[PDB]
């Protein structure tokens, strides 16, 4: 047999899958992150390998999806959310425990992989993953295999800056440019994101309602809503067709919080064509099937 | 034997290159553009084909770079550069007349594939090919393989919008927006290009000076000159920065007219890193070592 392991890493709790040849999942197990000793934090993923291996008999792949990346040169993991790992040679530290390769993504790209996996988009020549909740997460896909760029940033969209066409519609000189955690400004992260969503609001009508609350008023008719909601979807369709014109996905997968609100679904291809070269035809543009089981999947996908 | 056959399409002028296994280029012939009939153009290539096939002993593969797409629905060329076949299902025709697959690319994707395939950057993960002349051709590699995109625009840099940053280097409100031959406004295309630095230097300086003139006053020292090299390598810096951001390339190739501007080699890597992630680490960024053989190398490597 031909098992693969994917172990998704959070803050609170550690997710582990093995799947078989089929993709079929045979095992599925959730433990507690250690926050205390690296060691611990080891012992929990390692132990999981070796019981996962004596109940299957073989020695199955091992995939990890961490939120933040190992750098590219040190091995290191840069990862605020998990302390006992911060700053570890992940990667080196499991190859030597385990005996064979070890693959650690990001995230964001392991949620692509998941979707691009699909019975549906398999043979898909490309597929790009947007996570639109705390902030605009990408992964970019090519014929299956993630593509994680030169220091493992490939995909950071979220951290592009406004186009020309999106600032004119928001007034130019006048349009609200708003910080961003990596110490630039006007990236599309605080725009196109939940925070994004409501940060406009925000700006636009002084009132600080959250995503959902914005999204309720709109289905009631409030004229203050209507306008937040047309002008985001304008700026989402602007941004959107911009990556488009550079990226031109085949399938594009929609993830996070700000992904439920359906009407992203009818008002992109409605009002991308606009923004799109004339000759571009649309991207399949759906939600993403698999919520936040997905890290897993990826996860354990990066070695197919 | 296997024998890989490129042509490059121009409006003057067909080029035509046969490929050994090892990649060696092993013919190279070169025959007037028919401007007269869509027969004539058929002719040309299937004449190059048939030739080259007697000479080899072989059935080679048909690869073909066109200055232009074909509709990937349709088949139908759009390439108003070559008046006999434009409109035609280029494709569909020659692979009757050629009993063989048939596969026709972007002169830009040849260009990139045509590098990501020297010695030197085999093995590289991905590739980004930049042209940078009359306007901003842009080919993405992924192991070795260009990504075509939907509609065969994966790769069009060149109408994405100035980002934010760069709108700020050059006067927000006050700065120059030029029109695009896709209808579209502030495109990258009419500013980075050979044209593009031409264009930003008439817009302040008010005078039409080609590049390599304005080069030329750069290196005796002229004030107006000076200035416009420093606005555009922030420019160039700014722009790139964006895409990098996204795209996180291992190795970004430069061609066209402007990447004869060896100051762009130099400077590039001093001023990226302001305006990346600050994780983020500097993609190697050469000039193109094939000049022009790149549109037959690359369209051969098509069928690698
Ligand atoms: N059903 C929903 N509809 C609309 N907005 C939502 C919904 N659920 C959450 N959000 C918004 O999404 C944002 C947070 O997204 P969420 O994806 O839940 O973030 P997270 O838990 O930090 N994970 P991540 O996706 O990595 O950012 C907030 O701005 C919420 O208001
Ligand atoms: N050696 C050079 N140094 C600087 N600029 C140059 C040089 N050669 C050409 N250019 C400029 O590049 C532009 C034309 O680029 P060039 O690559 O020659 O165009 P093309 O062959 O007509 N089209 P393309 O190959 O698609 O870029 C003009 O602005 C020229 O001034
Ligand atoms: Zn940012
Ligand atoms: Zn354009």
Redesign the interface.
Known sequence: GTMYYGFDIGGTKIEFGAFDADLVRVARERVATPTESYAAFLDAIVTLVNNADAEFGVKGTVGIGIPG?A???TGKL?TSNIPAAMGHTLQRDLEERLQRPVKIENDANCFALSEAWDEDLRGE??VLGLILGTGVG?G?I??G?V???????????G?????????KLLG??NAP?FPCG?????CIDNYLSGRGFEQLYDHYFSEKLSAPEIIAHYEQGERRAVQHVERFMELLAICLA?????????VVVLGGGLSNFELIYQELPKRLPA???????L?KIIKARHGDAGGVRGAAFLNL
Not at 182 to 186: R, T
Not at 275 to 281: E, G, Q
Request: charged share 20%.
């Open positions: 990346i750098d590219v040169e840069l020549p490309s990408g970019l090519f014929n295999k593509h994680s760029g030169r220091a493992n940033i490939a995909g950071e969209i951290h592009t800056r406004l186009p020309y066409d999106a600032l130019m000189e440019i990596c110490k630039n400004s006007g911009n990556i488009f014109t550079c990226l031109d996905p085949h923004h799109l070269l004339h000759v571009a035809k991207p």
